[PDB]
Amino acid sequence: FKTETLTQNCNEILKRRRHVLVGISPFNSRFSEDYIHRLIAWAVREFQSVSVLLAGKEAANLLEALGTPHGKAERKVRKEVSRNRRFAEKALEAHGGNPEDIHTFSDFANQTAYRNLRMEVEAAFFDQTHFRNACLEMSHAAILGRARGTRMDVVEVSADMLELAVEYVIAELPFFIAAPDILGVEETLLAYHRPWKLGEQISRNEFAVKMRPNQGYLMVSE
C-alpha cells in the first residue's frame, strides 16, 4: 500500500506509527473479504495499534436514497455490517491484532465526545452554506458509485436524494476530525482509499469545524 496524507502535521503522526483507524463500508465496492484481509494485514504490519471503523446505522439512508424502503434498508445494513465485522475480526485475529477493536460510527450516539462533535458538525451544516455544500458533495459521492454499480439504468441523483443521504455524512464526520476524542487514543490516522477534499478545506480553517491536531487522514492505495 502506498499512502498520502492531508497535511504536514498528518505526516508527523504517520511517522510515529501509534494507531490507525481502518475505515470499512459494506456498500463501497472496494471492500471484498480478500481486500479487507490485505488491508488489515498491512495496517498491523505498519502501526502499533489497529482499530476498525465500520459504517453505522445511517448507512440505511444511503440505501433509502437509492429507493430501498426504510425497513428493508435497516435489515440490509445490519446484515452487511455484521458480515464486514466478521471479516475484520478474522483478519485482525489472523495477524495478531485484537478483534475487539472494531466499532461502527453509530456506537457512541450517547457518548459526550461524539455528541459534542456531532453538534459542531451539525451547527456548521445548518449555518454555513459552503460547509453544507461540501457535505452534500460527500453525500453525492457516497451514493453515486453504488447507483452506477448496482443498477441497469442511469438514475439521476436529485437534491432530495442528497438530503436523505447526507445524514450518513453528518454521522461519520466526527471520526474524520477527532476520532481520538471518541476512541480514547492519543492520536490516529483514519485510513481510506478515496481522497478527501473536504478534509483539506477543514484544515485550512474554511469552516466552523476544526481538524484536531491529533487526527490525520491517510489515503491508501494498492
Q: CA 166 from chain center: how many Å?
A: 13
Q: How far apart are CA 119 and CA 112, in angstroms?
A: 10
Instruction: Show the cell assigned to 184.
Output: 480514547
Is 134 annotated as ligand-binding? no
Catalytic residue selected from 25, 51, 139, 203: 25
Is 28 annotated as ligand-binding? yes
Is 35 annotated as ligand-binding? no
Q: Decide if 82 is catalytic.
A: no
Is 220 annotated as ligand-binding? no
Q: Which is nearest to 23 in space by CA: 189, 158, 157, 151? A: 189
Would you list the DSSP string of 96-160?
T--TT-EEETTTTTT-HHHHHHHHHHHHHHHH-HHHHHHHHHHHHHHHHHHHHHH-SS-PPPPHH
Beta bridge partners of 19: 49
Is 208 strand, coil or helix?
Answer: coil
Is 169 annotated as ligand-binding? yes
Strands 215-221 and 2-5 turn out to be antiparallel
Is 114 annotated as ligand-binding? no
Q: How far apart are CA 4 and CA 199, in angstroms?
A: 13
Q: How far apart are CA 205 and CA 213, in angstroms?
A: 13
CB-CB contact of 140 with 168 (8 Å): no
Is 198 annotated as ligand-binding? yes
Which residues are annotated binding-site positions?
28, 168-172, 192, 197-198
Would you please indicate which residues are annotated as catalytic (active-site) residues? 25
Instruction: Give the annotated binding-site residues for substrate.
Output: 28, 168-172, 192, 197-198
